[PDB]
Design an enzyme around this catalytic site. Structure first.
Site, mmCIF file in Angstrom:
data_model
loop_
_atom_site.group_PDB
_atom_site.id
_atom_site.type_symbol
_atom_site.label_atom_id
_atom_site.label_comp_id
_atom_site.label_asym_id
_atom_site.label_seq_id
_atom_site.Cartn_x
_atom_site.Cartn_y
_atom_site.Cartn_z
ATOM 1 N N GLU A 1 0.547 -1.382 0.147
ATOM 2 C CA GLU A 1 -0.400 0.094 0.329
ATOM 3 C C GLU A 1 0.544 1.397 0.075
ATOM 4 O O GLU A 1 1.499 1.311 1.305
ATOM 5 C CB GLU A 1 -1.047 -0.103 1.475
ATOM 6 C CG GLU A 1 -0.364 -0.141 2.230
ATOM 7 C CD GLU A 1 0.486 -0.983 2.789
ATOM 8 O OE1 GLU A 1 0.221 -2.126 2.793
ATOM 9 O OE2 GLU A 1 1.435 -0.795 3.922
HETATM 10 C C1 LIG Z 1 0.116 -2.811 14.327
HETATM 11 C C2 LIG Z 1 0.044 -3.092 12.779
HETATM 12 O O1 LIG Z 1 -1.303 -4.295 12.819
HETATM 13 N N1 LIG Z 1 -0.329 -2.861 12.327
HETATM 14 C C3 LIG Z 1 -0.346 -3.198 10.588
HETATM 15 C C4 LIG Z 1 0.509 -3.716 9.484
HETATM 16 O O2 LIG Z 1 1.036 -4.531 10.007
HETATM 17 C C5 LIG Z 1 -0.430 -3.970 8.374
HETATM 18 O O3 LIG Z 1 0.685 -4.059 7.425
HETATM 19 C C6 LIG Z 1 0.461 -5.844 6.805
HETATM 20 O O4 LIG Z 1 0.467 -6.800 7.466
HETATM 21 C C7 LIG Z 1 1.729 -6.973 7.726
HETATM 22 C C8 LIG Z 1 1.624 -7.702 9.160
HETATM 23 O O5 LIG Z 1 1.005 -8.608 9.067
HETATM 24 C C9 LIG Z 1 3.367 -5.877 7.578
HETATM 25 O O6 LIG Z 1 4.270 -6.790 7.999
HETATM 26 C C10 LIG Z 1 3.554 -5.830 6.262
HETATM 27 O O7 LIG Z 1 3.914 -4.012 6.149
HETATM 28 C C11 LIG Z 1 1.624 -5.334 5.327
HETATM 29 N N2 LIG Z 1 1.385 -6.296 4.721
HETATM 30 C C12 LIG Z 1 1.426 -5.764 2.976
HETATM 31 C C13 LIG Z 1 1.376 -6.951 2.266
HETATM 32 O O8 LIG Z 1 1.737 -4.503 2.802
HETATM 33 C C14 LIG Z 1 -1.352 -3.078 7.937
HETATM 34 C C15 LIG Z 1 -2.384 -3.198 6.738
HETATM 35 O O9 LIG Z 1 -3.162 -2.806 6.590
HETATM 36 O O10 LIG Z 1 -2.724 -3.302 9.531
HETATM 37 C C16 LIG Z 1 -1.617 -1.960 10.209
HETATM 38 O O11 LIG Z 1 -2.927 -2.271 10.801
#
Ligand SMILES: CC(=O)N[C@@H]1[C@@H](O)[C@H](O[C@@H]2O[C@H](CO)[C@@H](O)[C@H](O)[C@H]2NC(C)=O)[C@@H](CO)O[C@H]1O
Ligand SMILES: CC(=O)N[C@@H]1[C@@H](O)[C@H](O[C@@H]2O[C@H](CO)[C@@H](O)[C@H](O)[C@H]2NC(C)=O)[C@@H](CO)O[C@H]1O
Lengths: 858, 858
Positions: free
Chosen positions: B513
């Site tokens: 994203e």
């Molecule tokens: C603190 C938290 O939960 N933040 C969320 C991000 O972790 C999450 O990002 C996505 O999920 C993975 C972790 O499960 C991340 O490491 C990764 O960057 C990302 N995945 C991708 C495919 O981009 C985002 C998803 O919108 O939500 C946050 O709230």
């Protein structure tokens, strides 16, 4: 011919007890083969208001729970068929039933017959190819038509029997310690008693309906609650008195962190139920419902309560095999069970005299096993038993009916535990599978015929079961086909449970006493007689399967040590099949597991036992060993929770009585299931005597409590309900709540009836007084609404100063009296006792005014 | 000075959740700028067992996955640096940390913190030129040293959260439908389940070794097999039980004619494996290996099987960028992957907080990008993130290490798919290339300095990424130098793949994203507030690259339509470079390709997508469009196969939880990846509620399944293994086998959780029961031998009748209990349950007896 059967059918029978203690009065019962040399003399009188019956080609069939040992009219003779079926026949000296004459046929029977209910109805006559016809005055449930009243001391089992005969006079005393409590003294009293509760002065007002938040419950369970508010007269509307629900397990700690636990707050504008789980929410709602008054007032006390099960298993057992009970009665039973938090329905679906569950693939189990009719060849029915007449009598639950019952139980937080007896008490299956064998063999399909056969063709064993059946009562535990049968049956019933949404948790394989009673201690061998025992020829009596050649070869190969161990062995094998079908708990009556090493001997990770020893025979000490061997003890003592026994000692009452002479609401309630010895200070034995009890062994505790409705003399659904209710309310109370007067068990403590004073009887009697009053002033009215034909207790009554004083076992119930021999009845008012003279009768009335107890003379 | 840092380092931190739903309890989270007006209050307590700390020249740095919105002790203030790094500082009102006093600093943070694992370790203190030192009690992986336990309902996300908190009591229920199966019920059970198999009664005997004909396999692959027989205790000798192998593709037809397919015959004297190809032979051998029992018995069932992949792509994803994982852990992971037929290793080598692959020609990527340390100037390291302390923390795979991993994967039939994220999630590269720029510019080598620069000097954009980084997280997609960088990196890694003998088949360019989260729907602008959203000043928030002048000119010339389309445009351009390097498949997370017309928009002949929408947000319907647009869907749903999420709902468990609250072995196994809507009847949403799902669109089918280990809180290798295993076995099962309960997709079929009954749950539960038992009684013992620190599940337990009943999520595992508060532990035996009183604790034990699960109070 048919004319002969016709004539005989119009003979009028009269049955009259002559001597219940014939051995004490000279009869040599020992010589006659009576167990423990005990026998009774009875008079059968056949009165003929028609022309002479001189034909000789006839047999008159009758049923009795006692064997006939001698016939004292040499014109007749009596023989036993099998089970309770006997036949009366003319001898070569028979000269007919004279016109306008009563023929007397005195007989001797084994044991004693202390209740008129021992005598069974529907005698019937047969004669070469004619059709069987009942002696008409016996075609009834009203024993007065053919059984004379008992007189004098005929109710006594022995000359020293210390039981107390209940009549208005003695019953008044039995009830005198009780009284009616003011409505104000019964506020906020939930039944079963809740663990912790604080009632406040004010009442919530539910007359304008309640607003029920039931989102915590699955729809069927929610529907059950909604409907019960409606049954109890409480409207369910969005603008009613709120009743919120939530589920949060974390809110519960310790003993309270268990299925069915809840926290309840009843406030003056809203109510709150917090459950450990759905069952807990459901029970919280039942508690609110238990408070709804019977005056329609809709007022319940504000209160704060914490509540949880003392036991996870709170059972009601029902035999539908001896006599069938319709689906609607099972459903009513399940309704009341839910109302009082009983959560386990132990379903006794098969026995020797009936098989009541349709099994896909084995049509003969219900086509033949599900009915009894006079077919000496048992090709289309099992032989008649229990006085239901010679025509087809029976019934069975279809696969859909059974799935329906499971769904119904589950909506009510009740688990259905199916019991299919074996290896003993299997005559229905054995005979049905013999009919299947015969039928398939006729078609030349020998492998199909033998697939599920339960008989070893070589077996000529000579054994007698407790109900006087022969070797066909025992399924052969050594046949591969028997294991194919058990697998098939478990397989089929488990699938119904999965379709109904309640996969079996426990499989009950019966495990009743599988021995030849002719080798019991009360019988002696004719070669060498020992006094006081029934003299028989034991030289041809065998142990079960002793002559089975398949079992003999199974022992020889080292699978089982000897014949005596076959029952134990079979229970281990069933456990493997139960487990193979994904069921991880098995349960049995104790005899079926006694020979096992311990619970480690079974495949399932849990093994329960329906403990059924009496206390006066040492059950207060033998129970321990079962828990200590790792079994989960389901307390099922016959001296307290067998609901097929009499409510009171009176020869006009219904029930078997081998384990004790009576168990009324009070007695069931006074039973302390988790400290068995204490019962010595609070009950008497089968003969009304005090007993002593003590155990030195460790006692980890009971797993549950279960009350049993066996059905030998509960021939109709109404009779089943009379026997279960209202004492099942006492069962629910004790199964759910541990009272303060129930002491912690103490190894080495010896309770001595009439001598020790360890038990807080003051607290027990106060608890019982309040409970009895709750039943009389509130719950019985709910039983009325439920449509269950519960037993109404007969009043206790006496005349003093020329006025009538009456009392009742369940204070609150209306009492009526009659001074004109029962023609006209008047309401009894305690604060305005009636002046009476001469004969007076009393009876009680149900809260809705439609039903009455039997009437008795004061 | 240093003395001040010293004093502060000895302050003891305590972190205590106060309110996870602060917005429901009055706090105006909206005013504080919290997304969707949701915030939590936490207490930071700093205890001082030394003398007064009155110095003011200090900063205390700490990490958190949540932004701090308010500080409620006016002596302190907190500011955000970038990413997860924050700083706590004294205000003008600070009067010191008094001697022998605990200073309380309540704060408000965005969202909620439902697991203690949210709180990160290694806070550290700084002060003018002194060296940074951690607050010592925080220098640990043991959260108990500084994070208080959660109490009450602090685990709940909302007041209506319907998730079930797992404790021994509730976990017992969660496990109750399970049981332990007899060894005899688990014969010939290959994992993953084979397509067709017929087990025969007899067992081959491998205890004396096997004779392995591995001429069908290249040496390295053969060695892998030989070694696994040895690991599993099966000798490899020329006189052992024969195991012949052959490769004949023609022997396979239809769906079975695919790479990895095989035919397997296990006879009582010899075995036979016929493969479609080498992978097929290899898998055939793994199946034999899967049967090897853990009792060393060496007995496996004779059987006949036909087996083939349901999907060609059976992936395990591993993030080594957020926190590094050593080469030995990757190798162990690859070993288990081979064992269970997982064939794709998706290697997430770069992200914002680390770059882990040495790139010839670009030393700064690993010299700077491969480590984090407290250098506010990021000239020698990236800023500290994820609670690894202030000192240098990191690592990276050398060129040789990487070639070594590829060789290792290939011997095991696993394809390595390298992922280098861009344009978002590239902070490591951007900052490293800025350090390269700066260094080369210093030397006056301006063209060299700009050759690979990823920053547009003119760009002043103000954007915030999902992890709270600024514009440096985004590589500029409009620079020629950026394309020079991407070309160089692809070029270098492709050459390593060629040298390792496994030329890249797929290049994964990330495509996460790439948007400014401050413009998301949950935030609102301060000028005009809409209720329930985080109020911020959006007047200076831009879209990514909006202020980049190079991008503005690229749009103006007609290369790209506008700023919103830059990410899409960049993915098309990367596809050209991938193709220019001879790679004909590209893959990305869905967001990076959503704006594309269809797969025809890319240069490569194949484009895969890691589909990561949740189902309760409509993923059961949005997935269709991706296949229908020609992309190959790699199912990667976070609500089921994100292995960085918790195994169970308990605040002491590890994992992020944005997509769902838990995914245990059972849940992963219950996921039906090729009929997404059916999951509505077999799972619940993030808040434990039922959901509905239906699609009317065409669904050609999924290409593969992939499970992801993201590494934010998996700071060590052991933690990585705890999170992957053993649930990756469930992943392998489902990735390989289509179960009968996995229904064919039906357009228009609406599954309604808790209402519809389309899915054969009976069959699903039976399948899961058998699988769980295979893991408990056999495979976990192999994981022991593999050296992977898999998660052992905590027992489920309850006390009934005063005895302990325990159960487990993976039947077969040993259970232990303690009645002395965990001092002494005893083995639990189900068939001889222990009598217990008072506090009891339970824990499970690994098959080799050396490791234990965490212990919990019953
Ligand atoms: C603190 C938290 O939960 N933040 C969320 C991000 O972790 C999450 O990002 C996505 O999920 C993975 C972790 O499960 C991340 O490491 C990764 O960057 C990302 N995945 C991708 C495919 O981009 C985002 C998803 O919108 O939500 C946050 O709230
Ligand atoms: C006529 C009579 O009283 N016979 C007794 C049997 O009823 C009784 O059998 C046990 O009690 C139940 C009735 O209360 C029977 O229906 C049932 O078959 C049996 N119970 C079990 C668990 O087997 C036996 C008990 O020994 O005594 C007879 O004398």
């Amino acid at each position: 011919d048919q004319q002969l059967v016709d004539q005989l059918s119009q003979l009028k029978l009269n049955v009259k007890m002559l001597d219940n203690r014939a051995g004490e009065n000279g009869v040599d019962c020992a010589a006659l083969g009576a167990d423990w040399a005990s026998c009774n003399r009875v008079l059968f009188t056949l009165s003929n208001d028609g022309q002479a019956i001189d034909g000789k080609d006839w047999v008159i069939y009758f049923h009795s729970p006692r064997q006939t040992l001698r016939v004292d009219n040499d014109q007749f003779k009596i023989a036993h068929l099998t089970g309770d079926l006997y036949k009366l026949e003319p001898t070569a000296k028979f000269s007919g039933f004279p016109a306008g004459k009563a023929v007397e046929i005195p007989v001797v029977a084994e044991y004693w017959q202390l209740f008129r209910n021992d005598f069974l109805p529907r005698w019937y006559a047969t004669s070469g190819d004619a059709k069987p016809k009942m002696l008409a005055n016996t075609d009834t449930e009203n024993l007065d038509q053919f059984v004379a009243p008992f007189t004098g001391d005929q109710w006594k089992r022995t000359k020293d029997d210390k039981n107390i005969l209940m009549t208005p006079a003695s019953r008044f005393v039995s009830n005198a310690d009780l009284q009616t409590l003011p409505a104000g003294a019964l506020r906020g009293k939930i039944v079963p008693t809740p663990m912790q509760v604080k009632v406040h002065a004010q009442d919530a007002d539910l007359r304008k309906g309640v607003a029920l938040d039931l989102s915590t419950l699955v729809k069927p369970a929610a529907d059950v609650v909604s409907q019960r508010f409606a049954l109890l007269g409480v409207p369910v509307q969005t603008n009613g008195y709120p009743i919120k629900t939530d589920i949060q397990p974390g809110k519960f700690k310790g003993a309270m962190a268990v299925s069915g636990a809840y926290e309840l707050k009843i406030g003056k504008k809203e109510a709150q139920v917090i459950g450990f789980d759905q069952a807990g929410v459901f029970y919280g709602l039942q508690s609110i419902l238990s408070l709804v008054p019977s005056d329609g007032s809709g007022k319940i006390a504000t209160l704060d309560a914490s509540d949880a099960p003392r036991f996870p298993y709170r059972g009601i057992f029902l035999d539908v095999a001896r006599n069938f009970h319709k689906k609607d009665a099972v459903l009513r039973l399940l309704d009341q069970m839910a109302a009082y938090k009983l959560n386990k329905f132990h379903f006794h679906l098969s026995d020797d005299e009936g098989w009541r569950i349709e099994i896909p693939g084995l049509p003969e189990l219900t086509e033949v096993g599900g009915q009894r009719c006079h077919d000496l060849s048992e090709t289309t029915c099992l032989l008649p038993q229990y006085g239901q007449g010679p025509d087809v009598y029976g019934g069975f639950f279809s696969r859909q009916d059974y799935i329906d019952i499971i769904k119904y139980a589950q909506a009510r937080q009740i688990e259905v535990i199916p019991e299919i007896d074996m290896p003993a008490h299997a005559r229905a299956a054995v005979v049905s599978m013999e009919a299947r064998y015969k039928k398939l063999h006729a078609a030349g399909k020998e492998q199909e015929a033998n697939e599920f056969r339960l008989v070893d063709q070589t077996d000529t064993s000579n054994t007698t079961s407790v109900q006087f059946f022969n070797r066909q009562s025992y399924l052969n535990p050594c046949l591969d086909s028997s294991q194919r049968f058990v697998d098939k049956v478990i397989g089929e019933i488990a699938q119904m449970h999965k379709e109904a949404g309640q996969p079996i948790k426990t499989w009950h394989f019966g495990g009743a006493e599988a021995k030849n009673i002719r080798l019991g201690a009360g019988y002696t061998d004719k070669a060498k007689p020992e006094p006081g025992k029934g003299i028989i020829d034991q030289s041809n009596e065998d142990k079960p399967w002793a002559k089975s050649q398949v079992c003999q070869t199974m022992i020889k190969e080292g699978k089982v040590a000897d014949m005596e161990h076959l029952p134990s062995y079979f229970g281990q094998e069933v456990s493997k099949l139960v487990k193979a079908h994904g069921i991880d708990r098995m349960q049995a009556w104790q005899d079926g597991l006694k020979d096992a090493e311990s619970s480690k001997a079974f495949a399932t990770s849990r093994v329960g036992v329906n403990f059924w020893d009496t206390l006066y025979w040492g059950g207060f000490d033998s129970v321990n060993d079962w828990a200590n061997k790792g079994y989960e003890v389901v307390v099922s003592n016959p001296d307290y929770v067998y609901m097929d026994f009499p409510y009171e000692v009176n020869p006009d009452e219904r029930g078997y009585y081998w384990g004790t002479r009576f168990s009324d609401e009070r007695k069931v309630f006074s039973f302390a299931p988790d400290n068995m010895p204490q019962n010595a200070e609070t009950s008497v034995d089968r003969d009304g005597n005090h007993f002593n009890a003590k155990s030195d062994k460790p006692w980890p505790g009971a797993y549950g409590l279960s009350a049993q409705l066996w059905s030998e003399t509960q021939r109709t659904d109404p009779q089943m309900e009379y026997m279960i209710f209202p004492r099942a309310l006492s069962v629910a109370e004790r199964s759910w709540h541990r009272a303060g007067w129930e002491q912690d068990y103490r190894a080495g403590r010896e309770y001595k009836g009439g001598e020790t004073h360890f038990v807080d009887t003051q607290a027990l009697e106060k608890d019982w007084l309040r409970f009895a009053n709750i039943l009389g002033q509130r719950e019985l009215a709910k039983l009325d609404k439920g449509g269950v034909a519960y037993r109404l207790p007969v009043p206790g009554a006496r005349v003093a100063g020329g006025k009538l004083e009456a009392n009742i076992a369940l204070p609150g119930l209306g009492i009526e009296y009659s001074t004109d021999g029962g023609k006209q009845w008047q309401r009894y008012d305690a604060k305005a006792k009636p002046a009476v003279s001469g004969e007076v009768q009393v009876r009680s009335v149900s809260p809705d005014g439609k039903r009455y107890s039997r009437a008795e003379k004061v």
